[PDB]
Structure formats: C-alpha cells, structure tokens
Structure 1
Amino acid sequence: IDYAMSVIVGRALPEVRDGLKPVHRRVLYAMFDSGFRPDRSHAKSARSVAETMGNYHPHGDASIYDSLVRMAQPWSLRYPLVDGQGNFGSPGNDPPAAMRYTEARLTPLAMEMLREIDEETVDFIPNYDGRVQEPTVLPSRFPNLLANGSGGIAVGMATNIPPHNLRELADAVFWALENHDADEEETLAAVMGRVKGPDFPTAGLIVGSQGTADAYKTGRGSIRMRGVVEVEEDSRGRTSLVITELPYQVNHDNFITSIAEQVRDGKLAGISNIEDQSSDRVGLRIVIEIKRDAVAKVVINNLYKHTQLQTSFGANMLAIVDGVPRTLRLDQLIRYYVDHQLDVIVRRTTYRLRKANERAHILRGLVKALDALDEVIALIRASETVDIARAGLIELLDIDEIQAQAILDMQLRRLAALERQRIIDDLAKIEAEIADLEDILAKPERQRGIVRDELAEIVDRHGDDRRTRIIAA
C-alpha cells in the first residue's frame, strides 16, 4: 500500500534534520539512556545491542551491532559517533569481533547530538510495545547529515551524501544565521562559497569542480576522487611507488587484489612486486615496486585507469523532509538544519520556563512558611495527622496543595540560618531566570544568537583540519 513505501523509505533514507536512519538513532539513544558516555568506562557492545533490541528494535537482527560497529570506524565516519575498543574491523576485509569481545561508548560529538534531549526539544513517540517513548529525531547540535554524509538504497532511489568539514559547514551555517532574510539563490551562492566541498575521512584528493558544484546546485553530481601515491628510491636502488591514501570507501584488500589480478591478466606491466607496509604508526602504505625499465609516470596513470586509485563518488543528495523523500541543494540542506536548530532552541526555552515557574511557585510557598516558622511548626506538631497539617497550612498560609506538600516534605536541616537564606536567595535567582527565558522567547535575534554561540563552542572544541585536498587541475 501507500504506507508500505513510506516505511521502506524510512529505513532506507536519512532524515534531513539529524542525518540518521531509525537504526542508528535508536542505537545512539539507547547508549545515551544507558549512560555510556565518554567520561566513563567503555561498556561491552553486547550491552548496547541488548538495550536497543529490547526497547526499540525487537529483532535478533545483526543490523544493530553492524550500526554500532560502523559508527565507530574512523575510516567510514568523518566524525565518529561511537568510541570503540577492540576489534572493530579494518579498512580491508578483516571482520570485527563478536559483541561480547568488543567494548563501546559515545564520543563527545555524539553527546552533542543528544544535547538537551530531556528538555522536550524533539518529538517523542511510543515504541514498538508502547511501554517507552522514543525520539523521532535528535536535537543534532551539529550538522550531522552533511558532516558524516549518508548512503542508502530505496525503491531505486538510493541516497549518497558525502562527508564534509565541520569548520566549513559551521561557517555556512553562521552565514545562514545572520542572513535569515536572504533568498535561496543568494544563499546557494554564499554556502557554496564557504563549503569548499567533500572532506573524506580517508583524505585523498578531489580532481575538478564540476562534480562538486553540480551536486551542490542540482543535488546530483559525479565527484572524481584520487588516491595519493608517492615516488620513492628503494633499496634496489631503483623506483618504488608508494600509495599513502586511497579514495573514500575503497577497500584496501580488494584494491591490492585488483592490482595482482590485473597484473596476471597482463594488463599492468612495469610492476615487479606489491607489498603492504601499513601500520598504526605509518598508516596506509602500499609499496609497488616497478621494474628497472619502467617509467613511474606511466605506471601511475595506468593505475588510475585500471584500479580504484582513481574512482568517482556519485553524489545524490536525497533525504527525508517531513516524511517525504527529496533531492536537495546545499542551501536547502543548510536552511532545514538551521530551522531545526531554532525549533530546538524555542522548545528548550519553552520547557525551561515552564519548569522555572513550577520551581518559583514552590519557593514562594517555602518563603511564606519561613516568615511564619514558629506558627507552622506549632501547627504541624498540634496536627494529629499530616492531612490535618496539610489542610491547616493551606489555610494558615494561603497556598495550594502542592506548595503545602513541599513544606511538609522540607527537612529539618533546611531550617539552619544559612539554609533559610538560601531559599530566599534562590527565589530571587529563579525570578531572574524566568525573566531572561521570557526574553529569549520574545527576541528571535536572541534565539539565532544562541544557536550561533553554542555551535561556535562546538566547532572550537571538536572542529578539525580539512583532510581531502581539492585539485583544480
């Protein structure tokens, strides 16, 4: 039926607001709700998988651990959300260890995605069995969809958003925050000016400008990615080619294999031997030894030709906007994100203000009780029951049942001189807070300034240098 697709496209494509699919959102939220934060010891992955399975994804589905694992791989995510410990696989064919052998916890950036989620910043909905509530989206204090990108298949409509530099994106966002009046085309230009292009975790080089611009303005484009090969004098002492970087998503093992197989086919003469000298110290380092009668330049170009040393990234900016799949331009992605940020901020202050009032209400009744301490005390001791006392206090002080209950819940230790003053002082602080909150609600410029300052803090702390180099040649 019509809702069939609406569900297939839910597991297939990412939301534009946080850039996540239901699985990942569930996993992250589960870890959060479990307290698996960065300032705490890693927890066995089985714990996270289990918390997700029982509350949100009731399947012995391998897709849970698969999501947890992937969000931990620095070669897959430009900005990882999971902090892994143990065997989480490799850029090659080496498979990850079982749930029970690995440990995981959230990264500081992931903590920014969940920031203030308990302050009604996003809409929650009941889970599969209706016992608990789950988030439809995360606050996403940092532009995750564009930062980490996304890749998924729908009914022939598969998304393919590339990763980007956090510092750059933040610049584009800051511009959109100040130029709220601007029109799309005026914005499309400013954002395209700040975001130089994709920034893959694997580094490498992007060759050209067409693919990028096409993607940013038409939501579709072919980006030319190229590995990084160095030329070295070997112990031969002749020439050896050294590939230190590969294009995004290129499997190291499959790559080396294609070279050896392509060679045997006779398609890659000039090559004497291939050897992997990679390591955590040296990083990627595939040494290709060329024959003494060979030109480095010709071998290189033949590599670009017959291997993934040079490959294309087929960008397709397709995301879910209000439950409907859509192909977007960079300016739309940016505006939809900013809108969400603003929505989060108003909702946050709306919530804080409500709770601030409830707090002040109680305090006003505690202060009243203080000004009549001797009376309330005698009244309470004279009362045969707490009910009588509750009723007597309401009458005696002119307060409601909640306020009257707060007084009866008060502890002896709060009667100490400095304790009593603390109640007074608090009341003043709370009233001042309420005012400031009401001010934010009244001024859209204040709200805009808040998202800007908070985002700036985030970029200062977690922002990093660009990895992928753009080559106009």
Structure 2
Amino acid sequence: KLADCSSKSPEECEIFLVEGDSAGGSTKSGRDSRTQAILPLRGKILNVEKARLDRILNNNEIRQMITAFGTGIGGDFDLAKARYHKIVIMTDADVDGAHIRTLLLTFFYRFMRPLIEAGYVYIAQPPTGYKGLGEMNADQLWETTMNPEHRALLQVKLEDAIEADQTFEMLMGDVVENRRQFIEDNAVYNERNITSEMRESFLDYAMSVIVARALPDVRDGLKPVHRRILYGLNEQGMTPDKSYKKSARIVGDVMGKYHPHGDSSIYEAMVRMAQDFSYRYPLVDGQGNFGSMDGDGAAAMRFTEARMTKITLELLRDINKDTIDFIDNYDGNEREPSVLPARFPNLLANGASGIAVGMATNIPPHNLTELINGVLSLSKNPDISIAELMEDIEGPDFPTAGLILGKSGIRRAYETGRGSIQMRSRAVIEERGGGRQRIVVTEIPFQVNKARMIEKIAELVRDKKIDGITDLRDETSLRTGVRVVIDVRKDANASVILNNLYKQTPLQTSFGVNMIALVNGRPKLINLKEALVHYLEHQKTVVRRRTQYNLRKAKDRAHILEGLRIALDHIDEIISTIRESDTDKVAMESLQQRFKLSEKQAQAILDMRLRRLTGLERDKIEAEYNELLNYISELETILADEEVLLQLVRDELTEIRDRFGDDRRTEIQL
C-alpha cells in the first residue's frame, strides 16, 4: 500500500497518512516524490484503547504503519530505526477525519510514544470546503497543504503526560459515563498540545454524531439522513400518484444536494423505510428486492425503484407554506428543511434506534390510532398524567406483532423514559397426528433475524442443549405468512420444550427502551408525556405559520385581482394609457397615477393577456376574488382566537387518524 519516496535520509523524508485511495491519488500526484511518502489507510482505524493486544498486533492497517515507520512498538521502539522525521496525519477536512485523527494519535500515544516526544508527529491542514482530498486537484493539494513553502503544519507536543494519560482514557476508553460527562460539560449548542488536540477533535465528532447523525428530532422523529431522503423525494415530485423512480437517481440527488456521505448510508436508510418488518408506518414505497426478515439485503440500487407512501405526504404536508425553517445545505448551493411539518407523531409511531457518542437511543414503534387519541387527550388537558395517557396508549406496537409480557416495563419506560419490555413470539402447540405434536411460531419479536433464530434452535438441538425436538422447518411463504414449525418427540411435553425455547433463544427478546431525542437541538432523555407535548407544541406552530402564510398570499392575490378588476371596469381608458406610452416604464407609471394602482397592480395589468378580456375569463377574475375574500375571512378567524387554532390542529389529527390509523398488532398480556 505504501507509495514510498526516492530519498533514504529520514531527516528530510516525510510520510503522509491519508484515509484511502481516493485521497491518496490526489496526494501521489501533488507530492514531491523525492522526500514525500504516501500511506493510504482504509477509513476508520482500530481503537487501541478499547482493543485487546492480539487484535491490535494482527490488524492490517496497524501493521502497515509499524512496517512503514520501521521503529517497532512499545518497549522495542527505537527512534533511531525511524524512516521519516515527519509522520504527517492528513485526514479529510470533515468530522470523521477528526475522529480518524483521534484514533491515530491514540495508537501513536499507547505504542509509539517517543515518536510524539521527539516531535516527529504532525497534523496537515487541508482547506475546509472539501469532503475528501480526492475532490481536490493535485496542484490545489500541493500548494495549500504539502509544499514546505506555503503549508501550515501543527507539530504535536506532549506537555503533561499524566494529563494526557487521563485524556486518552476518558475519550477513547471503554467507560461511557466519563465521555458523556466530558461531552455535557464542553458541548456548545506552530505547536499543538496532544491533550488539546484530542479534546477538540473528539468533541467535534461526538457533537456532530449527536446533533447531526445518530439521534432523532422530537418534532418529526427523523435523523438527518431520513429527512434528506424524504425531502429529496418531495423535491423531485416522487409522490404516490406518480410512477416509481430509480433508486440510483434518488441516492445521487440526495448525496449531491444534501447528504455528503457514502451511497451505502443513504440507500440503506431508504431501504429500511420501505420495509414492512422494520417500519410500523413505512415511509418509502419500494419496487423490487428490498430485503427480508432473514437478514437478506436489498438488491443493488441499479435494480430497485422507489417513491413516497401516502402517509409520507402527511410528513411533508405544507412544507412550501412557511411552516418550517429552512437552512443552508453543507456547501451553500442548496436549501434544506431543519425539521419536517410532520402532520402525524412519527417519533413514537415508527420509533428510532441509534448509536451516538457517549449515548444511544431506543424508542419502540407505537399504534397511530392510540398516539393520535393520546395527543387529542393531551390537547384537552395540559395536566394529564402518564397513567391517563396510557388509557389511550396501551404500549408499543411492533410491525412484527407478537406479545409483550406485562405492563410494568411499559409503565416505567413511559414515566422515566427507560425500561425493559419483554417481547414474545406468537407460538402455539398443535397436533400433527399419530399422537405427536409441534410448536408453530407465526410472529417473531421485533428486530430478531428469523433465519439466525432458526439456526440458534438447530445449534441447541445439534449440541444436545435442548431435549424433545425431532424436526425444525421454516414454512414461511408470501401466501401463508411467517410459519416456523418445531416438531416435538412423541410423549414429550411441548409446553416445557416451548418454555425452554423462550429461555434459550431469541424467541423471547427484551426491548430496552432508552428515549433520547433532540429537544431544542440538545439530546434529552424524555418520557411519554414530554414526547407528545413537544409534538403538540410543533403542530400548533406548523398550523399557525401555514395560516399566517396563506393569509399573506391570499391578500397579495386579492390586491392583484383588485387591480385587474379596476382594469376590466375601465378597459378603453387602460388601453389608451398603454397605447399612448412609448415604453413599458411610461405605461406602468401613467397607469399607477391615472388609476391609483400599485407597481404590482400595474405590472399585472401590463402582463394581462388579450384572451383574459372574454366573458368567461372576466367572470373567473370576479369569482377568484369573491372566493379569496371569504378565504381571507376564514383565515383571519383562526388567528383571532387560540381555541379555534387548537381545534383545527385536533380536526386535522382526527382526519389523519381516520385515514391512516390501523389495528393494534402487538398483544399486551397480563
């Protein structure tokens, strides 16, 4: 992998460490091949702080660096046997590049500490504004970053060693709480000391993963990748009435315009939203192989096609009506939504799961009818308890159905935001004839791989870890649904074999609820009431802003129509005014003066076509106006009374509940 230099005098030789071959190519073209070597790594390197020594010494990327430096590791480390006097870390000018830098400084600190001590370790500084060095032209990477005449390099300096020893243990170690504490105390919503560098770069990454990757927003229940996918579909008119659009086009559009990450991350997020076993209310409607419950992946994006589901329209409803705030995209060239209008409670409906830095999230799916009735009960009573809300919201409702054992785990999860929810498969004991029996599984727990589960039972039987099982078959079909058959030995108690399967296999899986969502852009552990309160505050805002916008637009349009009506009342005069004018400026000024018209009104008259002078067209102008006057009155009523605004929110949620609300799938047992 190493693209070495001509020279063999380490004192003048430099080694540049890059993320992969895309950045490597630009680097090999722009460099000085006499004194500058290039080692392209393969993305994220191993965390030596969290890893076992054997794993470290056998890792291909760790080995490639050891071999290239020629200094050996730990105690056998000889700074004399070094092949470069500058080890230059040149990761990409993004948050994951900062993370790879922290992962590298950690390996150098725990294994090659004298390399830092000798001042041999540097950090390159490529221009921000690129996603990778592979986006840069060789001449651009050279002058800015690699030429010793123009480059700005940071030399890594280890000042206090005990402070550094505590830093690497805090940020890179296996104890989460210390990292969480560090993020909480520090989050904000030339030589360089290693401790400062590790703290600033790790906080850059942690923060970014927390607010812009792994955690959902409380208002719409979406993570940046899902929001950008849905918006991408909205922008391209990939609505349910239109035909399916190729996945490659959606992925490429979303990536180019909103998501500066790999295709794999975008396509896989899109695929999951299109799976009925993953989403309680699927957001994407996919044509083709979108994977299975057996862990089978979707077909490559060239084969599949997609569009929004009917319910996705409710997530994007009124986005163009000044309901939500837009922000600049990653490069300034595009505008993206900060949140979606979310006309149905998506956070609780589809749930969420995401591994962040210092924290994680695990919100289960819920039944739409129960959520809406929950939100409606809350609208009528701000003081409602979790117990009362539970009269509406019984508990989670998995797309895979099954059983939940007891309401105590649910109660605790809705009150504290944390709890263990015991899930069970739908299994029954039935006869197969000849005095023999079988166990028939028709519903498996949520997020459990059906094939992998069957293989675990197979494994237990083969290893004689369970008694009574004579056969095991997956009789699932498009036609009969999920059907897993476990044949029992004649005279053996099948209820005992079933109880054993529940203790030994994923046939019984628990769901550890950990309700962390972004509230006002900060991660917060929330309870059931809080999740709903935030959803309702959001809906009141969306509806109010839509009404304020529709009113501004209706007034602007009534204004224009008042001008067209004046023109229809004085057509000969209007014509004479335009005809007697040499320019469009003169006509516009003369019209404004003669008929007390605004600039907007006179431009509208000047833009009016001759076909608009016929009987039908004259009528259309009068009818649009009379309709709009009534519409302005209707809107002005909504903004004059807060109880009328709140009742519209309730009426709109009621319509959604009546159209999209479905039956409970998951049975809650006592």
TM-score (norm 1): 0.97
The answer to whether the aligner puts 1:25 opposite 2:227 as a matched pair is yes
- Are the aligned partners of 1:176 and 1:187 in contact in 2 as well (CA < 8 Å)? no
Question: What corresponds to 2:520 in structure 1?
Answer: 322
Match of 2:362 in 1: 160
Q: Which runs of 5+ in 1 are unaligned?
A: none
Which amino acid in the other structure matches residue 149 of structure 1? Answer: G
Q: CA deviation at 1:124?
A: 0.6
User: CA–CA distance in 2 between the matches of 1:395 and 1:131?
Assistant: 42
Give the match for residue 88 of structure 1: 290
The CA deviation at 1:237 is: 5.6
Alignment of 1:293-332 (within 5 A): 293-332=491-530
Superposed displacement of residue 137, structure 1: 0.4
Q: Say if 1:169 and 1:133 are closer, same or farther in 2 by CA, change over 3 A.
A: same
Question: How do 1:67-106 residues align onto structure 2 when only pairs under 5 Å count?
Answer: 67-106=269-308
Separation in structure 1 between the aligned mates of residue 229 and residue 346 of structure 2, nearest angstrom: 16
Q: Please tell me whether residue 170 in structure 1 is matched to residue 366 in structure 2.
A: no
Aligned to 1:264: 462
Partner residue in 1 for 2:83: none
Greater relative contact order structure (CA < 8 Å, 6+ sep) = 1
Match of 1:125 in 2: 327
Q: Which amino acid is 2:301 matched to? A: M
State how far apart, in whole Å, the 1-side matches of 2:459 and 2:340 are: 46
Q: Does the 8 A contact of 1:192 with 1:330 survive in 2?
A: no
User: Partners in 2 of 1:449 and 1:258 — Cα distance?
Assistant: 53
Q: Number of paired residues?
A: 468
Deviation, 1:381, is 2.1
1:432 and 1:306 mapped to 2: Cα distance?
Answer: 67
Distance 1:237 1:45, change over 3 A: farther
CA distance in 2 between counterparts of 1:334 and 1:398 reads: 52
Q: Which residues of 2 match residues 335-374 of structure 1 at below 5 A?
A: 335-374=533-572
Shift of 1:192: 1.9
Alignment partners' CA distance in 2, 1:206 and 1:465: 16
Give the one of 598, 601, 625 matched to 1:403. Answer: 601
Give the counterpart letter for 1:27 in structure 2: I
Q: Aligned to 2:302, what secondary structure does the other structure show?
A: helix
| 2:247 paired residue number | 45
- Does residue 221 of structure 1 match 2:422? no
Q: Is the Cα contact below 8 Å between 1:114 and 1:138 reproduced in 2?
A: yes
In the TM superposition, what is the alpha-carbon distance from 1:236 to its structure 2 partner? 5.0
Distance 1:87 1:442 in 2: 52
Letter aligned with residue 458 of structure 1: I
> How far off is 1:3 after superposition?
5.2
Q: Which moved more, 1:251-260 or 1:412-421?
A: 412-421
1:376 to partner: Cα distance: 0.7
Q: Per-residue displacement from partner, 1:353-407 (whole Å, max 9, x unpaired)?
A: 1111111111111111111111111222232222221122112111121110100
Q: Secondary structure at the match of 1:83?
A: strand
AA partner of residue 635 (structure 2)? L
> Aligned match of 1:199 in 397, 421, 439?
397
Paired residue secondary structure (1:160):
strand
Provide Cα deviations, 1:395-437, integer angstroms capped at 9, x if missing partner: 2111121110100100111111232232223222222222221
C-alpha change, 1:56 and 1:236, in structure 2 (3 Å) is farther
- CA apart distance, 1:453: 1.0
CA distance in 2, matches of 1:58, 1:4: 15
Give me the CA root mean square deviation: 1.3
> In the aligned structure 1, how far is the partner of 2:623 from the partner of 2:266?
49
Structure 1 residue 56 and structure 2 residue 254: aligned?
A: no
Give SS of 2:509's match.
strand
- Percent sequence identity over matched residues? 55
Q: State the one-letter code of the partner of 1:216.
A: Y
**Which is worse superposed, 378-387 or 12-21?**
378-387
Deviation at 1:250, TM superposition (A): 0.7
Pairwise CA distance, 1:177: 1.5
Provide Cα deviations, 1:201-222, integer angstroms capped at 9, x if missing partner.
0000000111000000011000
Q: Do 2:612 and 2:618's aligned partners in 1 also have CA atoms closer than 8 Å?
A: yes
For 2:45, the equivalent position in structure 1 comes to none
1:167-207 alpha-carbon deviations (Å, 9 max, x no partner)? 0011111111122xx33xx3323212210000000000000
- Does residue 413 of the first structure (1) align with residue 611 of the second (2)? yes
Deviation of the 1:4 alpha carbon: 4.2
CA distance in 1, matches of 2:456, 2:333: 51
Which of 438, 442, 453 pairs up with 2:640?
442
Which residue number corresponds to residue 135 of structure 1? 337
The offset of 1:77, in angstroms, is: 0.5
Alignment equivalent of 1:113, drawn from 315, 324, 341 = 315
2:518 partner SS? strand
Alignment partner of 1:278 out of 454, 473, 476: 476
Report the TM-score when normalising by structure 2. Answer: 0.69
Q: Are the structure 2 counterparts of residues 4 and 59 from structure 1 closer, same or farther at C-alpha, using a change threshold of 3 Å?
A: closer
Which residue identity is paired with 1:442? A
SS of 2:438 mapped into structure 1: strand
- Determine helix, strand or coil for the equivalent of 1:62: helix
Structure 1 residues 67-121: Cα deviation after superposition (integer angstroms, max 9, x where no partner): 1000001000101000011101100122210001011110011110000000110
> What runs of 5+ residues in structure 2 fail to find an aligned partner?
1-199
Give the AA of the match of 2:207.
S
Please tell me whether the aligned partners of residues 436 and 491 of structure 2 are also in contact (alpha carbons under 8 angstroms). Answer: no
